[PDB]
């Protein structure tokens, strides 16, 4: 906005802004017993099995 005092005039301006992503990683560890993975595949024998 111009005005009538002795101040210098104002040229038009421009602003240029740069933004970027941030990478984030997540990890969880599960252990499964070897007998538990095995007997999911072993065959049915009896009602107690």
């Amino acid at each position: 906005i111009a005005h009538g005092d002795g101040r210098r005039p104002n040229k038009q301006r421009q602003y240029i802004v740069m933004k970027a992503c941030n990478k984030h990683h997540i990890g969880a560890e599960i252990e499964l017993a070897a007998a538990d993975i095995e007997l999911l595949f072993a065959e049915k024998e009896t009602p107690l099995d």
Binding site: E45, T46, L48, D49
Partner: protein, 49 residues
């Protein structure tokens, strides 16, 4: 010269229950004997006088 015969055996299959030895035993098929710890037969002999 030529062959005359090629002869083999057939194995005489004798199971436990066909023999008369099972008169001296009592046969029960038991699915999971791998799981048993102990057996137990419990007598209570009341003696008269």
């Amino acid at each position: 010269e030529a062959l005359l015969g090629v002869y083999t055996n057939v194995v005489e299959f004798v199971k436990f229950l066909e023999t008369a030895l099972a008169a001296a035993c009592v046969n029960t098929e038991f699915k999971d004997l791998r799981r048993m710890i102990d057996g137990k037969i419990q007598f209570k002999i009341s003696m008269p006088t």
